[PDB]
Amino acid sequence: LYFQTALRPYHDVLSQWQRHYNADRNRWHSAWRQANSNNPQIETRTGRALKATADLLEDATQPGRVALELRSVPLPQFPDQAFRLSHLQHMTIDAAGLMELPDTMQQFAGLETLTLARNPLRALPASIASLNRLRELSIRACPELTELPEPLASTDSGEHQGLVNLQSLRLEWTGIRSLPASIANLQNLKSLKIRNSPLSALGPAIHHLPKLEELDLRGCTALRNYPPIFGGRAPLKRLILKDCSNLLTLPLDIHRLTQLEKLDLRGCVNLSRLPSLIAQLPANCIILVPPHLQAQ
Ligand SMILES: [Cl-]
Ligand SMILES: [Cl-]
Ligand SMILES: [Cl-]
């Protein structure tokens, strides 16, 4: 009745966090052990392993620390007060049983690179798109991640917001089936790799990316058509469609990739024909094809 604020010491937050995940093991614990099944040297005693994580978290808050590297230590979720890590420029969370990232990713405002690997992660928070300093985002072996958040970037005025500094996006062995339309808004994206994922479709606006030089879609066995170029002037130099086993067609206007230097079609066993105007690709463009297409 006579209230007229406070803040739990991080060490108390971390002790509560350890006791919590030590008691409540659903989902994360088997995922963390599975991800590390070929690593018998990691700490697998649950309390000790969570304590190791807590200690690394506490260390990362100190000045000096540029990077938080969590490899094979358990981190089901970040403890509260994640804003303590706002100064970090690099973060890796690998084989950690990571189930979810903080809803307010703005708390990691300093990040220039983020790598998430071998986690049961099902979604990325929408606020991940507020990381304006993020240059590289890498997600590998996160089979339960089925969608990217949106918008990834937006454009007014013509002014740009969101992941405006992102240069490289890698999504390998994920459950992602399609990309947000806003992918085409990433003004600084130079390299897009989506590998071994059920990517089912790709829109032609991907060719409107102003700086995209490399598109690597290898092992996307659900992809059945590659989209037309149309008016797209993306300065694409490398197009890797290796082992897209169900790819049936390339567009007829594929020759509009006037800067193409490498086209890799090996393992495209269902690609019935090449476009006739594939002779119109640049002379010094290395084209690799499966045997059934070599004659053409
Ligand atoms: Cl560095
Ligand atoms: Cl800045
Ligand atoms: Cl979107």
From TrEMBL:
Domain of life: Bacteria
Entry protein name: Type III effector Xcv3220-like C-terminal domain-containing protein
